[PDB]
From Swiss-Prot:
Active site: 72 (proton acceptor)
Catalytic activity: Hydrolyzes single-stranded DNA or mismatched double-stranded DNA and polynucleotides, releasing free uracil
Family named by the database record: Belongs to the uracil-DNA glycosylase (UDG) superfamily. UNG family.
Included stretch of the parent chain: 107 to 334 of 334
Protein name per its UniProtKB record: Uracil-DNA glycosylase
Intracellular or extracellular location(s): Host nucleus
Species lineage: Viruses, Duplodnaviria, Heunggongvirae, Peploviricota, Herviviricetes
Length: 228
């Protein structure tokens, strides 16, 4: 009833129903949804409605191997498409993303890199790219950061970790580290500074992609091909 409609509106893959449906019982979720609707009527909200929950379509909760946390979606038209860090195909990768891709290449000299910045391939292979804030007003960073998306996304991630022990989490920067705190005994929790070229430590030196694959391998899971 509430779910049937919710799914209708954002075109959510039913496989995610058990992790999300419980959020609909919280009166705060209705407040969040009404505020999002009001903002769509008065400002230019990004990404497009159909892309807000694109992350639910590429893999099921059971296929998730790695979780990478983002903060805010890109705020210029045509950049964001529902996944953290990723930009639409044919959009040159901005600075932070270039650093993430440089680190993949430093870890895997044999990886064939396309030069593009769309991470749909990773998503289909079980890499969940999730922002804590899912929408933004065009041209204004963090403009929708207080309407409650982080509360809803936090609930979904808690239920996932609870259901799936042995996940790899990649937490880059202070926000992601404060936002999510999975049990380090049950999951592989990896931390590093932010990919931004303004960080004191060069992100190109990050070895998370390599460490994650070694972890998966010690657990009989196939490694992720990080080329893109």
């Amino acid at each position: 009833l509430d779910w049937t409609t919710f799914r209708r509106v954002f075109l959510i893959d039913d496989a995610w129903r058990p992790l999300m449906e419980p959020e609909l019982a919280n009166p705060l979720t209705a407040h969040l949804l009404a505020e999002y609707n009001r903002r769509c009527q008065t400002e230019e909200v990004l990404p497009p409605r159909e892309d807000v929950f694109s992350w639910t379509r590429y893999c099921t909760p059971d296929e998730v191997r790695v979780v990478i946390i983002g903060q805010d979606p890109y705020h210029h038209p045509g950049q964001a498409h529902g996944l953290a860090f990723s930009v639409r195909a044919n959009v040159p990768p901005p600075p932070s993303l270039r650093n993430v891709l440089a680190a993949v290449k430093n870890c895997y000299p044999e990886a064939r890199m396309s030069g593009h910045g769309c991470l749909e391939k990773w998503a289909r292979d079980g890499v969940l790219l999730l922002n804590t804030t899912l929408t933004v007003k065009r041209g204004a960073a963090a403009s929708h950061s207080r309407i409650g998306w982080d509360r809803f996304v936090g609930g979904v991630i808690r239920r996932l970790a609870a259901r799936r022990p042995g996940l790899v989490f990649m937490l880059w920067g202070t926000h992601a580290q404060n936002a999510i705190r999975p049990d380090p005994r049950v999951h592989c929790v990896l931390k590093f500074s932010h990919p931004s070229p303004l960080s004191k430590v060069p992100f190109g030196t990050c070895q998370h992609f390599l460490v994650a694959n070694r972890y998966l391998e010690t657990r009989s899971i196939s490694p992720i091909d990080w080329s893109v």
